[PDB]
């Protein structure tokens, strides 16, 4: 079906919180071949973040239960197999998103905003793969994540003001990549705080619609800094 | 998989909020043939409640959007019908489990009351989206299940028992929501609440948690229905 109907259906799913159907709609929209608007990129991002977050949370809970129990037990093998199931379907989701990014979105992105956005999504989901990968697959996923983040970070430094909410979300997630993946608290803190300060300087010159998002993201940067400092 | 391992996986999925897996685990346990402890009955109830309530909320959202609304309206109605189909599938699964395995082979009056309450619940969920004679019959079945559970509970259980209280709560909601009489729903909730308070000094500690909460809910309904 043409874009209009898919967008209506995806938005109705978002209202009903049927994120699987929303994701299907937006995958169809993307695969139609044409470039997406900001509305459509937000729909895609929201949908897939929602379908992947449930698997991420389940995995985190299951793995906290796995390491919180005694070894060499039959009870433990069931938990590990369940963790492997959730890992498998999370990897399938991430692979879907990354395929959409490699075949359609990034390639045909025409403006630097969309490039930053899609490269940030690439980094996010390769990071999601890294948080569940091992050994060489882990090295691969981390390298790809960091490369995408770095390309977006450079494009953003060169094309966006330090107040643009996309640039600030990129900085937030990239510092989180530094702290959680690379295990570098100092550089995570530095990246996040630099984004913060450079944003605060130019804040008075900014749009209310962007003010909400930007001040939210800056507040999140400050909270991450407080957590990482402790 | 074996019952013990099965309910282990059920608790695991529960803590992971993977309610579809939890529901399939508990369906397998039930279809094994043996009866369920109070904790396992709770597992099954929670699992299927989550899976059906996702779709209940979706259906309410969509029907609301439809009321305020056009090709748009056609798409809205088709999507609502999809959600309704999923809801009917889930409810039929639960009701089939109740008829074949759970209600039939129940040992205690308390388990029978629990399963009858659950049957009332899911026929009520089916009636929330019914039209015509199907609506009449689903309301009939829900009320019949609730009334049988109510009669058995007041015959064999004390007013303070949490199962009896939960039955009163959901049966009062059925009166207020499906049949549409605030006075009778209020009277049911209030008679349950007051009867529980009358004893209370007899209630044992195991139930302190459940009963208390349920009673609060009763009072909450009575507050929401007096405004």
């Amino acid at each position: 079906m043409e874009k209009t109907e898919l967008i209506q259906k995806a938005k109705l799913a978002e209202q009903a919180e049927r994120y699987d159907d929303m994701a299907t709609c937006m995958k169809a929209v993307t695969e139609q071949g044409a470039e997406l608007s900001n509305e459509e990129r937000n729909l895609l991002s929201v949908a897939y973040k929602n379908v992947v977050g449930g698997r991420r949370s389940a995995w985190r809970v299951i793995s906290s239960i796995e390491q919180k129990t005694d070894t060499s037990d039959k009870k433990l093998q069931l938990i590990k197999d369940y963790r492997e199931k959730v890992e498998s379907e999370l990897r399938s989701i991430c692979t879907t998103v990354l395929e959409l990014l490699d075949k359609y979105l990034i390639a045909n992105a025409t403006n630097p905003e969309s490039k930053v956005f899609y490269l940030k999504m690439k980094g996010d989901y390769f990071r999601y793969l890294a948080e569940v990968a091992c050994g060489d697959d882990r090295k691969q996923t981390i390298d790809n994540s960091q490369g995408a983040y770095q390309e977006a970070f450079d494009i953003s430094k060169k094309e966006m003001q330090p107040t643009h909410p996309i640039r600030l979300g990129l900085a937030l997630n990239f510092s989180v990549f530094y702290y959680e993946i690379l295990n570098n608290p100092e550089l995570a803190c530095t990246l996040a705080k630099t984004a913060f300060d450079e944003a605060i300087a130019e804040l008075d010159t900014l749009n209310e619609d962007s003010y909400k998002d930007s001040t939210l993201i800056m507040q999140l940067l400050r909270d991450n800094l407080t957590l990482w400092t402790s | 998989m074996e019952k013990t391992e099965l309910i282990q996986k059920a608790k695991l999925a529960e803590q992971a909020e993977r309610y579809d897996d939890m529901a399939t685990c508990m369906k397998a346990v039930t279809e094994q043939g043996a009866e369920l402890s109070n904790e396992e009955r709770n597992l099954l109830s929670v699992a299927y409640k989550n899976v059906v309530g996702g779709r209940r909320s979706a259906w309410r959202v969509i029907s609301s959007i439809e009321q305020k609304t056009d090709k748009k309206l056609q798409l809205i109605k088709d999507y609502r019908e999809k959600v309704e189909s999923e809801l009917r599938s889930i409810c039929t699964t639960v009701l089939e489990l109740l008829d074949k395995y759970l209600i039939a082979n129940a040992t205690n009056p308390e388990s029978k009351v629990f399963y009858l309450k659950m049957k009332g619940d899911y026929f009520r969920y089916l009636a929330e989206v019914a039209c015509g004679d199907d609506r009449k019959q689903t309301i009939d079945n829900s009320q019949g299940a609730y009334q049988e559970a109510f009669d058995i509970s007041k015959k064999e259980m004390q007013p303070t028992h949490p199962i009896r209280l939960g039955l009163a709560l959901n049966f009062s909601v059925f009166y207020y929501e499906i049949l549409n009489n605030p006075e009778l729903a209020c009277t049911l909730a209030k008679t349950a609440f007051d009867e529980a308070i009358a004893e209370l000094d007899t209630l044992n500690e195991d139930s302190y948690k459940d009963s208390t909460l349920i009673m609060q809910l009763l009072r909450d309904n009575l507050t929401l229905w007096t405004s």
């Binding site: 999140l220 991450n224 990482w228 | 709770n42 409640k49």
Partner: peptide, 18 residues
């Protein structure tokens, strides 16, 4: 709505699930 039983149910990044 009226109450009934039973009821349904790190670093910060964006976006976040609802």
């Amino acid at each position: 709505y009226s109450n009934t039983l039973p009821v349904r149910k790190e670093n910060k990044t964006l976006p976040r699930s609802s």
